Symmetry: C8
Subunit: 232 residues, 8 copies
């Protein structure tokens, strides 16, 4: 409920793909398979592949990827640097949604709990009676931890006690990730290109004005033949 609450708060306070990723996470039915073989795969996949898809999507939604591939494809493109600058700007704009997804899914330690439960060392939580049993038997039990309606072995492991531990580890990792990302962003904004920016601004203005003028002249050239044919 906290995720939906912050979603509504972000909507009220309200570049846009961030809210898209947040909403998609808050409305995605995370279901851990709760099996010793697919737990790790499912957790790491939910952690890894959605940001990759968001990266690709952010590249696709960009309106000027066509000019980029056109210039990269030609031997001598009609300058040499606005291309690198435009590509860097596109990549930087696209990298936002994956980072938001990773941060959200780490602060909410569901993927971490699903992925690292079967193999983690939970020895302070395992009951004192069954403190000597094969780790192969512990594998299934620990894998069933992230499932409330499946874990029916409270006599061996306290579920909430290990859930809180793993979730705290996940939140620590999330805050570390956020700090590193913010430091990198600070360095980037403090270091980084002057002529390329002006050239790109000019080319964008030129494209817009050309499109508008083309629409206008098409309308004017159509009005004449319209008056000609209608009078028939």
């Amino acid at each position: 409920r906290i995720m939906v609450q912050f979603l509504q708060a972000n909507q009220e306070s309200f570049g846009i793909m961030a809210l898209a990723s947040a909403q998609m996470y808050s409305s995605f039915e995370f279901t851990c398979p709760c099996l010793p073989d697919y737990n790790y795969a499912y957790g790491i996949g939910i952690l890894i592949v959605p940001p990759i898809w968001f990266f690709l999507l952010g590249y696709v939604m960009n309106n000027n990827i066509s000019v980029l591939t056109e210039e990269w494809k030609r031997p001598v493109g009609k300058d040499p640097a606005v291309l690198r600058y435009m590509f860097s700007s596109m990549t930087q704009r696209a990298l936002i949604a994956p980072a938001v997804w990773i941060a959200v899914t780490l602060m909410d330690g569901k993927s971490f709990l699903c992925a690292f439960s079967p193999t983690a060392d939970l020895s302070e939580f395992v009951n004192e009676s069954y403190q000597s049993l094969s780790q192969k038997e512990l594998l299934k039990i620990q894998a069933k931890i992230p499932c409330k309606d499946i874990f029916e072995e409270h006599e061996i492991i306290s579920r909430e006690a290990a859930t809180r531990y793993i979730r705290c580890l996940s939140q620590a990792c999330g805050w570390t990730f956020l700090m590193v990302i913010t430091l990198v962003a600070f360095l980037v904004r403090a270091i980084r290109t002057q002529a390329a920016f002006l050239k790109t601004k000019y080319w964008s203005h030129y494209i817009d004005t050309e499109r508008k003028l083309f629409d206008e002249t098409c309308k004017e050239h159509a009005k004449s033949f319209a008056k000609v044919c209608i009078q028939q």
Copy 2:
């Protein structure tokens, strides 16, 4: 509830047929027949035929299919190319809603669960007591899995344990589909036609201006006889 939540979030953030398909799924009463003979048929049908209907509908709602069939029907149409371009644009605009429907119904593994439950290999979930019994007897039991109010054989198969497994497989398939679709869209937007676009823009502007001029001249030609007849 997550589907309706993301529906409301999409409505708040808000080409339109995507929201139409999402809403239609979130408000469609999926009822698995829970029978070994019609489970597969019903699941695959819900997966397959609604996107076909959405494709046809998107073709019908298009305002310029009439000109397409008129030109395809004539021996020598009044150019050759803008037709192929217009048809490709129509098809690309129409293909959006089916993809959204398939993605949604795969992320929510209801159709997958209904379709693949009776024949899947659920051997780690079947109880150890009835681990040796005819697969024909297992057919009905496994078919009854997606039905909460019908599956009354908890002593043979854990329902939730297999539900999570099949739903995880469905979500994996959904993410794979999304990745492939995004890659194809990236390639299409990066590869693909210059004169046809301008010709289509000009023809659209001409049609609009002609319609507006016709309305205007009809009003002007009517005003005279109106003043003539009213004075009687």
Copy 3:
């Protein structure tokens, strides 16, 4: 609740009679009589007569049925064609609400369940104990199926198991109907009349301009006598 949800979604997204029929269905208290003699009649009636009433209503709400009957009544009407075109347009606009009603009431298999329950062949659901009894005794029991608060014979037939079966059949029929209707609409929009359209547009513009001019000249002719009489 799904019907009301999609009603609200359609209202938010928002020719109008479609929403009218959807709302009327979502707010109509469908009560199956649950009797072997009136079940079929009630179900088929709810399926058939409301779309007929919607058809008639859509014909009545049309603002230019009077001109149609005036021209059809005269021996020589003041052209021949715009009449057929206007009538076809009226019929096509009117046929929308009945189709929406039928589609909605088929996707929600209440009418189908009420109509086909007493006579359908439910042999896989009838308990194995009373698997040999007179179909006349089965008539009342099966007729009582669509009534939750009346069906008190769970020892003979599983209610939900047959409800899901009949509802799935109804949804299949609904999707078939939708596909056929969409194909017919595609063919109609792709095949079908050029002069009649322009003539109808001109006549509509003429009628509107004449009405407006009549209002204006009435006001002007009234102002004089108003100034005359007020000064008394």
Copy 4:
């Protein structure tokens, strides 16, 4: 709850007296007396007298009933025809709310259930044990049917089974009424008066312009004496 839902839907979609009657029904506490002597009277009264009051009210709210009675009262009124046309238009506008009330109260078979329960033939619902008893004893029991908190004789008659039967009959009668009304409206709009309409339009415009001119000239004639007296 369905009536209030459709009330809100009609409000959202939104001549006005229709919504007034619908709201008044949805907010009127229908209380069947549940007595063999007053059941019929109360049901038929709720069915009959509210539409009569709505008819009278619609006549009263009409702004030009005074001119109608003034002309009907004079020996030679200052034309002959616009009176009949104005009266017919008033009656047609007024007849809307009673029809809406009757349709609503028939689709919701409360009045029908209250009125026809004590005397209807409910022989398939009366228990097999007391299948031979004086109809005078059955009178009170059947009269108590529409009262949930009063009918405490479930061992003699199944309440819901007869409630559904009578409600289905009421809904059939309601749909029949709607069909007949729609057919009559279609015939009226298709048959029916040309000069009277123009005369009424002109007289209405004249009245409006005269009122506006009178207000203006009153203000102008007052301004002079205002400037005269204020300066004192």
Copy 5:
């Protein structure tokens, strides 16, 4: 809850005192004293005195009662007729809220139930065992009827059975009152004064224009001395 629902519906659809009286009733804590001596007094008082207060209030809120008493007080007032017309108009505008209050409190048979319960003849509801006991003992019991939390003698009288009876009588009286009021309003609007209306319109326009001119000339006469004193 029905009263508040219709209150909200009236607010949504939305001379104003009608809504005021409706709201005041829907938010007034009607508490029957449930005593054989004060029941009648309290019921009749709630029925009678609030409309009297509403009448007085509607007279007070009227902006031109001062001119009425000024002219009625003078021996020779500065015409004779517009006074009677203005007074009749004031009374007619004021009489709306009391009628609405009476209609509402009669349709909701609380006052009727509180007032007429102790003395009404409820012989078909009194149990057959205590069918022979002093009416003085029946007085207290019947008086306690409108109180749910006080009436603890279900073995002598069925509370709901008599509540429905008295409430039905109250609703009948309410509909009769509404019909009579509507008939009287129809007769009044059909019968009833020509010069007085114009004179009142002119006097109102004159008063308004004089007030506006006085404000304007006060501002103009103040501006001069303002410019004079500010410069000091």
Copy 6:
């Protein structure tokens, strides 16, 4: 809940201090001390001192009390009459909120119940067993009546039966108060001063115009030195 409901209704329908007092009452935690010594004091205090504070507050919020005390303080004030008129107008505007508070707190008989419970004569409610006991013992019991969670002596006095009685008395007193206040307001508006009103209107317009002119001339006199100093 009725008080908050009417608060919301008044807010929707919406001199302002009336709503302020209503809101303050609906959001004030009335806690009867339920002791034989402080009950009367607390009830009468809640009845008396909040209207006094509202009176004082309404006097303070008035924007022209300073001119009143300035003129009352001087031996010869710069006319004699507009002072009495302004003071009367201020007092009349201020007297609204106390009356609203008293009316509200009387219609909701909480203060009356808290104040008059310990000493009232409740002899028809005291049980027949303890009908002969010292009034000093009855004092505490009756004082505990307005407290639901404290009154634990149901065997001696029926709590609700006396609560309804006292609340009915309170509502009677409230309606009497409202009637008397409305009669007094009618007499005041019908009796009551002509030159003083015009003088006050003129002085108010003069004050407003002087303030506006002073602001304007301050801005103009500042602009010059602004242009002078900025250029440095």
Copy 7:
């Protein structure tokens, strides 16, 4: 819930710091320590230090404290009086929020209950059995009174009976405080400085005009060099 209700009512009716303090109180988790040593300290602290912080905050948020300290710091400031007037106005504007906080926290007798419970004389509430025991033992019990989930000694002291008593005392103190504050405000507004007000108004207008002129001239002086450098 009453505090939040009045918060919403104040928001709907809606110098601003008053609502800030009200909201901060309604959303502050008051937790009495329920210990004989820290109860008094915590209660008095919640009563005393938040208004001090609000006073300081209101001083800080004031936009012209800098000019005040600048003039107070100089030996001969560039007049003598507007400083005292500006300081008095600042203090009066700042004193609003602390008074609102104190009034709110006194009307809601939580701080009073927490502070005065351990040492108050509650002898009419202590049970008759333990009416002779060391006050040191009574200290802990009485201190635990404001805690619902901690006070588990109902056999010695009735919790609600003393809670109501102390809360009534707190409300009395709150009303006394409000009356005294209103009287002081009345005296202040009736007594209190003519030239200082005009001087402050003029200085404020001058500051505003100077700021606006400076922005304008900065823009104009920048435009020239902008046109100069851009053309390079």
Copy 8:
């Protein structure tokens, strides 16, 4: 719920990073690990590192950090003081969100409770029976205090009694922090730079005007070649 309530109140009343930090806290799932080794670390981390990240973020979001690092990097920057002033202004604007976070997380004593529970001296709460046991055994029990669903040793320590104590200490620390911060802010606003402010204002206006002029001249220079190329 109080935090979300004040969040909504702040949103309604509504430099922006304050609301961001408040929302992020109200929607952050604080999960104390409830272990004697990681409790302190987790609590202090939640207290310390989020404000550091907010500080860095506020530095990054600042639009003119690039000019700061450009001037700090050059040997002789194109003045010497607007840099120090701009840096101080940036730091002061950035320091807001960390302070809000610390204040919020201290008023809501969750971090304090998680951090200081295992080592605090809770001797008045430990039961009298186990008042002599190794502090190593008390370590785990006290560490489990902030966990409602884990602390299952009510026979040794009263959970709520110590929770209230530690939360009161946390609130005291929070109010102390707020007072110190407000005093420092008062001193800063009262002490602190005249030429630097004007220079920064001028440079900002110059930058804005230059950007706008550059956009304009780019559009004008593009229009010519647009008209040139379109005509081809």
